[PDB]
From a paper:
The two gel-forming mucins MUC5AC and MUC5B constitute the main structural components of the mucus protecting the underlying epithelia in the respiratory system. The VWD assemblies are formed by the VWD domain, C8, trypsin inhibitor like (TIL) and E domains, except the VWD’ domain that only has the TIL and E domains. We determined the cryoEM structures of the wild type D3 assembly of the human MUC5AC mucin and the structural single nucleotide polymorphisms (SNP) variants Arg996Gln and Arg1201Trp that affect intermolecular interactions. The D3 assembly forms covalent dimers that can appear in two alternative conformations, open and closed, where the closed conformation dimers interact through an arginine-rich loop in the TIL3 domain to form tetramers.
The rs36189285 SNP corresponds to Arg996Gln, while rs878913005 corresponds to Arg1201Trp, both substituting the for MUC5AC typical arginines. The Arg996Gln mutation, located in VWD3 β9, is placed directly in the interface between the VWD3 and the TIL3 domain. The substitution results in a slight reduction of the distance between the two domains. No interactions involving this residue are observed in the WT or in Arg996Gln, but considering the resolution limitations a hydrogen bond between Arg996 or Gln996 and a TIL3 β1-β2 loop residue cannot be completely ruled out. Only when 2D templates from WT open conformation were used for particle picking, these could be detected in the Arg996Gln sample. The ratio in Arg996Gln dataset, 98:2, illustrates the important reduction in open conformation particles from 17% in the WT to only 2%. The open conformation was not detected in the D’D3CysD1 Arg99Gln cryoEM preparation during standard particle picking. Only template picking based on the WT open structure revealed a few particles. This observation, together with the described reduction of the distance between VWD3 and TIL3 domains, suggests that this mutation stabilizes the closed conformation and reduces the steric repulsion between Arg996 and TIL3. The mutation Arg996Gln, frequent in Asian population, affects the distance and the dynamics between the TIL3 domain and the VWD3, directly interfering in the conformational change and oligomerization.
Residue numbers in the entry:
A (entry chain A), B (entry chain B): 899 to 1229
The structure:
């Protein structure tokens, strides 16, 4: 299969091999890099970087915008939209923008796909052909967890703070420091945080409990809820729960955890007047007939997307994907 | 028409005549009382009381449960459910429980109807025949705003704190004090609070701006968002916005303010598998054919309810109102 590097919440990271760590810093860092040391192995260089800003009062940092550089093309992901800056007249545009469920998906011919929740999280999937050829925060794709702490010089350092700060992009940006305990800083929020995050240990995720241990995700939920004290704590809780749900869906199990009282969705909003063709799919539709993807072609490469999806009627089965309405014929 | 006494948020009150004031207290208080001084004017006594608990750290108090006493019948409204305690074998049950939209509606033959949002708010509508015969926090229904501060002894006192504390139900409960400024107490939340509550001054409520001045509601939204720092600030903001929306709907204007990113609803959750018969009605359906209310009878006495409503198909047009599904025939 394809390994996944996941970044979400307040500095929560998961390497391709499987190593997990927490690191926060008000700077710009590189997640995945190509051709480390300038070794152009007959492949175009691709680089993914992230920008972190201090959110909250404890000192935690959360991702704000993501910049993608590949083949001379620069893309900006901020405020829930895509902005193109670096344009190359020659060659051909290698990225395709597609909105599926609640995630923004970008596909590249080189084999790199990214999933964006448009608020804080980001998921990276890499083709197996790039094994042992990438460097960055996600670590080398050598399937070895212990040696994922290379500090930009092919040297493993046990200090997670030093490893994280070695990949900073701005030389003038300040060095990171050891974070404090958000729950200790804000004791009065601990009860509400525990009550909200107890759903992870509830019967809803009983099936996924055996496959994936939720202790780390539960701790992340508690810490984020404790720290998300600057407004919109519901967003922090929903992002943590959605990250755990996506992790569960990656294995293959499907869980329908969303309720009208817990992180609700408004699929009916997109429904046109007098018609109802939108529903919430927890597993997600495998393949949908669109103008860009006809009925014959499905392209079910990525699985694990959730959100509102249009259920076109037997008449006009193909979805426009541009006007947000079922169309009889795609031009 | 019928005057409305509205209680919502952190001690926000609106008298029947129109007087507005703010008062918070960790005690039990009587909203509307009947037969003041024991004057049984050939009418059964009805009494509505509320219980307030300290929510947050600033010191603000919000309603938790509501108890209704009338004709020897006692009802409890807590945890989003109705519990019956006082049961009278003789006579007949005078209250009917009906769930419409997002509000819980109780109807009485005497002419008293209450709307409950199940979280913090409560709306009281009184028949004009009870003019000048009721006492309590809502004040006498004499259509005079200046003399609404009777301190349980037919004496008007300019001290709002004294007027509020004169109606306490527990003699041993402590006296209330002057509240502080939540935004001053929590300065870092002011920017987010203002950004969220700025929707009131936006173009969405332009039509209602002329009829109703939103300055008081804007201040209430800002104060509640500043004080709602113990978790679930989104609930506080949504309750304030919904209170303003109900106030707008009382005049007659209809506003569709809910968006998937601002206080969303999950009407699709109640939809059975393979069927879609639920939609969000901002104005609210005037009358719906139910088992208790057939097609011939509409009973459009109360207007201004919003939430998810079932749109039954031409087949099985009457709604069950008990099994949450359209039924062909009501037994
Ligand atoms: Ca490694
Ligand atoms: Ca009066």
């Amino acid at each position: 299969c394809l390994a996944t590097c996941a970044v979400y919440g307040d500095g929560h990271y998961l390497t391709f091999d499987g190593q997990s760590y927490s690191f926060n810093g008000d700077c710009e860092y590189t997640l995945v890099q190509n051709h480390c040391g300038g070794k152009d192995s007959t492949q175009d260089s691709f680089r993914v970087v992230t920008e972190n800003v201090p959110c909250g009062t404890t000192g935690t940092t959360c991702s704000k915008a993501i910049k993608i550089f590949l083949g001379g093309f620069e893309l900006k992901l901020s405020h829930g939209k895509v902005e193109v800056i670096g344009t190359d007249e020659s060659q051909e545009v290698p990225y395709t923008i597609q909105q599926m469920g609640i995630y923004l998906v970008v596909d590249t011919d080189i084999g790199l796909v990214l999933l964006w929740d448009k608020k804080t999280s980001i998921f990276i999937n890499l083709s197996p052909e790039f094994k042992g050829r990438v460097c960055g925060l996600c670590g080398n794709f050598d399937d070895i967890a212990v040696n994922d702490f290379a500090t930009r010089s092919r040297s493993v350092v046990g200090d997670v703070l030093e490893f994280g700060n070695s990949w900073k992009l701005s030389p003038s940006c300040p060095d990171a420091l050891a974070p404090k305990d958000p729950c200790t800083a804000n004791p009065f929020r601990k009860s509400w945080a525990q009550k909200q995050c107890s759903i992870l240990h509830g019967p809803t995720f009983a099936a996924c409990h055996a496959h994936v241990e939720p202790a780390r995700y539960y701790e992340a939920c508690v810490n984020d809820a404790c720290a998300c004290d600057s407004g919109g704590d519901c967003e922090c809780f929903c992002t943590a729960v959605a990250a755990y749900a996506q992790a569960c869906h990656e294995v293959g199990l499907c869980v329908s955890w969303r309720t009208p009282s817990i992180c609700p969705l408004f699929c009916d909003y997109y429904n046109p007047e007098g018609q109802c063709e939108w529903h919430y799919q927890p597993c997600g539709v495998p393949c949908l007939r669109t103008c860009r993807n006809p009925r014959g072609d499905c392209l079910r490469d990525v699985r694990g997307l959730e959100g509102c999806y249009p259920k076109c009627p037997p008449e006009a089965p193909i979805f426009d994907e541009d006007k947000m309405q079922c169309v009889a014929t795609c031009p």
